[PDB]
């Protein structure tokens, strides 16, 4: 029962549909977005790395890895994970705007462990992780955003990362 009227554009960086687009790394039933290296600063202009997690099976676990503030010297000094309360709070697209929604009301049946490994299931600890339910009734797409563009080192700015999770319906009988 906790949400706010955050408004995000999907990209505060100037790049628009010239995003570098990639799918998740789907091993067995684990679909993984791993922003450890693709967000550290290389080119001087920030660019946008989008990670697309398309799901139409029961019990797909989704793991998203964003690097923490200062886990390496100088490289991720100004990361922003939005939504902060995520995986419990996700973003959905509201007319070319991204606004917070509660994930448990969005997809019923969603399995969220309180500790992702032993550490708490929150981007504070640097990985979030959730398992999609056996029945998903309406097609749902939701967003997680992790941003390294504020970080600057050696006159190079880090990249901006978006996860889009697209769930098609399954389990339905109608």
């Amino acid at each position, epitope marked *: 029962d906790l949400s706010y009227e955050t408004t995000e554009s999907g990209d505060t960086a100037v790049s628009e549909d010239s995003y*570098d687009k990639y799918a998740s790394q*789907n091993t067995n039933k684990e679909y993984v977005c791993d*922003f450890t*290296d693709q967000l*550290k600063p290389t080119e001087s202009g920030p660019k946008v*790395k989008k990670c697309e997690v398309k799901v139409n099976e029961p019990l797909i676990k989704v793991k998203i890895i964003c690097p923490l503030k200062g886990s390496v010297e100088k490289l991720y000094d100004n990361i922003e994970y939005v939504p902060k309360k995520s995986p419990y709070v996700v973003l959905t697209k509201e007319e070319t705007k991204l606004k917070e929604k509660l994930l448990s009301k969005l997809i019923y049946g969603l399995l969220i462990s309180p500790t992702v490994n032993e550490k708490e299931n929150n981007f504070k600890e640097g990985v979030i992780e959730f398992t999609l339910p056996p029945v998903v009734h309406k097609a749902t797409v939701f967003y997680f955003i992790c941003d390294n563009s504020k970080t600057e080192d050696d006159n190079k700015k880090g990249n901006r990362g978006i996860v889009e999770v697209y769930v098609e319906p399954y389990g339905g009988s109608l």
Partner: antibody
Amino acid sequence: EVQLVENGGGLVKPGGSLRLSCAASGFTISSYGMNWVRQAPGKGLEWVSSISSGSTYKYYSDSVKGRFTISRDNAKNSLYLQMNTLRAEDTAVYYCARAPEPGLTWFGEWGDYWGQGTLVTVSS
Amino acid sequence: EIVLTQSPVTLSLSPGERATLSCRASLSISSSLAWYQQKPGQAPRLLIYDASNRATGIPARFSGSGSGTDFTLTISSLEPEDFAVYYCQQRSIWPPITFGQGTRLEIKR
């Protein structure tokens, strides 16, 4: 048994166009990302392009983008590259390589098998 | 663009010796490095994938190692068929995916 065979290389005068083919034999292409690498005579290897299965995600080098288009037929087990507005910088041997499916993290046996090479000479 | 510099540019060594090859990265890539052999006028061949796993049918003398910036291919005891040009390649920060420039193995006579 497991082979990757390219045809299509040639001498085109500069600013010309040319279509390059990679036909696989002995395995199904559909579970694999497919790539093109070039190697100018006397230097190392340089990545040209990569395509996902089906064609949902395709990726190019900065020097070939706009000029070159990558495409794939899974049913024909084939990878194709369309090279237009060629320069003498594009003169090289062009290899295709099988890879695991591309990701944000492309961790795997990239370049598990490579093509034979085709020579593309661009001079007047 | 992560630039991968490979040292030494030419290595001379007698067969039956340990051979260590160094690949140095611009910005601490996360062990996505592959190691390739290429002989004169021939297709490249994968030796070590994911910086430490050797490929299927590559001998047991070839052993990849390292982390971060510094990676190392070690060929534990040379054979005449081991003398060729060698290339590292990263895929941690991409597109583009980038190679080294090469290292020769001649035979010491």
